[PDB]
Amino acid sequence: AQNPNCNIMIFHPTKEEFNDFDKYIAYMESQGAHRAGLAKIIPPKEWKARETYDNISEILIATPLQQVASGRAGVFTQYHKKKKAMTVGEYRHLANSKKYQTPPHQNFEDLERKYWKNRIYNSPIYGADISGSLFDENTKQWNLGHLGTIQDLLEKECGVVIEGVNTPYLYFGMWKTTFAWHTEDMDLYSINYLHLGEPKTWYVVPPEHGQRLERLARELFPGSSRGCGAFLRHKVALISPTVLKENGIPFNRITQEAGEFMVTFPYGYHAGFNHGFNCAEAINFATPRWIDYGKMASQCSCGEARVTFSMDAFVRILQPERYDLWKRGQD
Numbered sequence: 001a002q003n004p005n006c007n008i009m010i011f012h013p014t015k016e017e018f019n020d021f022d023k024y025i026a027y028m029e030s031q032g033a034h035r036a037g038l039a040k041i042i043p044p045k046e047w048k049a050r051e052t053y054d055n056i057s058e059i060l061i062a063t064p065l066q067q068v069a070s071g072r073a074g075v076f077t078q079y080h081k082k083k084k085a086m087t088v089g090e091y092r093h094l095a096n097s098k099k100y101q102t103p104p105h106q107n108f109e110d111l112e113r114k115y116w117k118n119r120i121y122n123s124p125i126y127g128a129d130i131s132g133s134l135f136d137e138n139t140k141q142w143n144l145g146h147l148g149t150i151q152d153l154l155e156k157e158c159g160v161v162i163e164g165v166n167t168p169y170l171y172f173g174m175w176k177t178t179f180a181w182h183t184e185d186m187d188l189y190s191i192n193y194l195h196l197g198e199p200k201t202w203y204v205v206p207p208e209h210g211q212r213l214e215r216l217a218r219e220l221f222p223g224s225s226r227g228c229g230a231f232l233r234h235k236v237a238l239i240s241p242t243v244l245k246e247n248g249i250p251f252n253r254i255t256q257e258a259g260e261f262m263v264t265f266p267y268g269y270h271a272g273f274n275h276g277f278n279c280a281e282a283i284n285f286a287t288p289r290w291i292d293y294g295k296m297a298s299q300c301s302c303g304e305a306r307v308t309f310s311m312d313a314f315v316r317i318l319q320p321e322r323y324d325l326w327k328r329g330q331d
């Protein structure tokens with residue numbers, strides 16, 4: 001069995017190996033990468049996502065989200081308060097202000113320490129989930145707006161034709177902006193490219209141990225657990241590495257820098273934070289190996305998780321028994 005300790009693997013494809021996206025994912029899995037839940041892919045030196053970022057300040061963040069925390073430093077939830085629209089140029093200036101900027105620090109470890117110590121005492125503003133792409137249309141390799149669609153994968157594997165579309169999303173971050181513990185919708189893969197700016201630190205639980213994290217989460221968030229049998233789908237709960245280590249939960253951590261891709265694998269729980277002003281692009285995708293995970297994915301039916309149009313068909317075809325109750329949640 002490859003990668004039996006479930007370590008995060010880092011890949012350095014050549015320009016030749018960067019041509020065929022599906023093939024390279026399957027290669028990484030042949031080496032055991034999926035067992036970690038997360039992999040890093042460093043693009044060949046010849047590749048670029050686009051020529052420059054000099055012209056992005058006019059993108060609109062229609063609904064910036066102020067991430068307000070409740071709880072204790074190592075175990076908290078966050079709620080998203082909607083703020084007035086602002087441009088990326090306005091957001092960048094905000095991120096760089098004295099109130100929101102990254103503090104002085106020695107290295108990534110010192111910054112990680114300061115994040116876990118102090119996150120809860122601040123409310124950083126996140127421009128999340130903005131439909132769009134920063135890949136140049138002429139970038140032919142690993143262009144996250146040109147991937148094969150999940151609908152087409154399901155059709156190729158299972159024969160059924162379904163409605164729905166699959167497009168990327170932009171994320172504009174600042175110091176302390178936080179992504180809560182989650183897996184993807186329908187336990188899909190994700191791919192995330194850090195276009196510019198400061199790093200993103202990731203934490204991940206191997207897929208084979210995801211239920212251990214769920215059981216801890218039910219213990220740590222007991223009212224939330226009573227409210228919903230899949231409350232991590234709400235994407236609000238944070239648990240620190242120190243607390244994970246105290247409770248024996250297997251995990252790994254890695255920091256992504258600008259110019260790097262990360263892939264999350266089906267049912268790989270992940271969480272993290274941004275080090276300063278940055279812009280990431282991410283999209284879900286599927287492979288044949290995902291289908292079985294899609295069939296078994298939990299679902300939020302309490303009504304809180306409220307997701308995309310395209311998830312309907314996935315539930316309807318892969319989980320027909322759950323369909324009815326899940327759609328009651330969405331309506």
Ligand SMILES: O=C(O)CNC(=O)C(=O)O
Pocket residue numbers: 171178179190191192264270280282283
């Ligand atoms: O970058 C972020 O804020 C969150 N991204 C993801 O969870 C992902 O790419 O799967």
Ligand SMILES: [Mg+2]
Pocket residue numbers: 055056057058059
């Ligand atoms: Mg612009």
Ligand code: NI
Pocket residue numbers: 182183184190264270
């Ligand atoms: Ni994710």
Ligand SMILES: [Zn+2]
Pocket residue numbers: 227228229230231233234300301302303304305
């Ligand atoms: Zn729910």
